[PDB]
Amino acid sequence: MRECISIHVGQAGVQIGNACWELYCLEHGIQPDGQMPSDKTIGGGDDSFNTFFSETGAGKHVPRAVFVDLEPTVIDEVRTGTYRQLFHPEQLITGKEDAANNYARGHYTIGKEIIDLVLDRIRKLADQCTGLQGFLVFHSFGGGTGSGFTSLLMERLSVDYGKKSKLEFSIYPAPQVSTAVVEPYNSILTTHTTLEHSDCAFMVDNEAIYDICRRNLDIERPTYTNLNRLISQIVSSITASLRFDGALNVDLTEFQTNLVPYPRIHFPLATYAPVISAEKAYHEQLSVAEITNACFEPANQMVKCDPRHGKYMACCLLYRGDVVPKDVNAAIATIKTKRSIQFVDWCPTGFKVGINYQPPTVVPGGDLAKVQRAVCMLSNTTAIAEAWARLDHKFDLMYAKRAFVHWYVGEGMEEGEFSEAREDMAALEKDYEEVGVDSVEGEGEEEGEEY
């Protein structure tokens, strides 16, 4: 029973959770009311996969989800929506104001009196679980709740459970586009928790996904629904290895064993290759080589960063559908001969491969074409440093004059939690710069004894 508990914090977290749970319900043939007529039609089976859904006596299936936010609006949209009967009635929503783009308000003042209930319900979910693999936390940098309350919850979880993996999916601020004036402060103040407590953090950018939607899917006016659906596809590709049979299955521990060389560099990028519209699904073969090559194109990255400016440290490919090992081997072999893709000299292997038989599903009303093959790549590289550096600059431009600071100090913080965070960012950037340097020439300086 490869059980995984999902936690959604903030508006971005709740909406990505809506998309994710729509996809999960469609994958296993669960109706919006929690019933599964597939078993009744067939007679019995294991289709109620215990990764996400828990089966009660009467044939209903309750998801292993925990939605949290400080605004009643975002989750009251779910309590009276299509999926109102699917979730347990307990949704952990503080009937008060919100963090208000304020890390201090979400971490110290209002984050209290809601953390205890959240931890209690997480404990109740964990008690029902046997062989719990880890957590999947969804949130967004730049928001008050998704920064402060996520920090508090991650701290408490690291205190309590400790050894269980805690993966992170977060929406990083874009370089140019933004939706708040105090995004850099909230983003920078979360580095301590996203570093010390998480085991692997996946970052995505709205500008990159908008570019992908405009260029590949030919959607000129996308909304957040398309972005959430793409992120849901990414998470499903990650988690499919422990729900369906396959030639090579990759658990959540193999992830961390293969992708993170050192504890402090666990920030891999993610990407999905066969992102294509229904009309353009024709005129294309969609073979293993094509999707595998498209995973490495800088235009297809989900974060505004150029891999050509850095070096690849580790790669994990997860294939779905009608795929065979020899095509994957040929794709990796032809990739290794390209000079535009550089690997660090101290990781000569540089690839982890997993294959799953279940092909990706299509959500009605969606925009992704039905395909026979797919691949999700997760790549730990050094180009991500750039994504920090720009944001770091922005932070300085506001902290030189102490703008917007009185709101933060008026809720419980002092200015030093505003420098300590900056120094931690600087140290992280120094680490990323140091790891990517080539080994010094003949690293034992030089050698050669008599004979």
Binding site: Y108, T109, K112, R402, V405, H406, V409, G410, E411, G412, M413, E414, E415, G416, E417, S419
Partner: protein, 389 residues
Amino acid sequence: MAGASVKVAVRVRPFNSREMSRDSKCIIQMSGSTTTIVNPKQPKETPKSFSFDYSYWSHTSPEDINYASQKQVYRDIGEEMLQHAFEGYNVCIFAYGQTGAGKSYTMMGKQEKDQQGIIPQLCEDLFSRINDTTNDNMSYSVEVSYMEIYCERVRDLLNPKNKGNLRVREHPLLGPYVEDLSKLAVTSYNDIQDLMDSGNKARTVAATNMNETSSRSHAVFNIIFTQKRHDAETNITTEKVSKISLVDLAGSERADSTGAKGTRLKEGANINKSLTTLGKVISALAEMDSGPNKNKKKKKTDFIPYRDSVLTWLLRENLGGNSRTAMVAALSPADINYDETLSTLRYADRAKQIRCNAVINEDPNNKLIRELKDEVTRLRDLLYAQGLG
């Protein structure tokens, strides 16, 4: 009108009875104008470093070698500030710290009078210099005021009436002031210290997880000093009016250290906002002081955000214009209170922020090896030169 350069001084205290009873380890080191600190929980990473105008090693009270004696710090700060006050211009002394560090010692000193703080010594020197210049033609007057600021509301500390919120006004010529503020005259430092004890009994203090008696409100003891001269004429004229401000701060805090709600959160938030505003104004004043002092230019008059807090608003005359200021910050040597000491450093570094550099202490073994290798090379180059090799 002139600059407002700020002198930054930091002192460490000895171990108290509890700390010396325990086997706690010291964590603060000082050298020159640099103070360095080490994480007890992360000894492997690095020390942090800061640089102030004055670093005082008062760890060992009876010690003589590199001991920060009370007379030394007086001669460094208080004597010069008193002289500037006597010249006829304003001066202010800020006391910043958190409970445990021991600010009130350096702010007052002990009753034994062999180890005295800034204030009793300042009062003694003030009245000694006054009484040593009372010639026929000179008259002197001194008066004292004492008031607190709690949640941005001013209260009187001497008057025993109901502690209402006094109103703050702005006289067009005399600047900001407080209405109905009781002002008393003094003649001996004993009266000053008695009034200080009487007012200190009236402070608003509440128990924290850090200490059972912590200041929850800022407080000021202001000394107004008037000099009148009688020239060869029938008129006796006031020459100059100067002020000595003795401001006491309520130190910063984190909600983690004291996780109590209600009044505690409001008090902590207002104290932190006041400290942030005070630091901002002092930093701007120090930058403007430094700039013209070397450039001699008059880049308009800048804008100094005095009005953002009542604390800086009342002290507008003492902070700015022609004046001199100096903030003294107390530390705690206990390892357990690391989060306090470093925090104080981050507030002590503010204003006159200067490059600290890295304090480097090379290994004696590597130094010896390098020196011996260089000596071997030099001697070989000498011997091969004289064709002896």
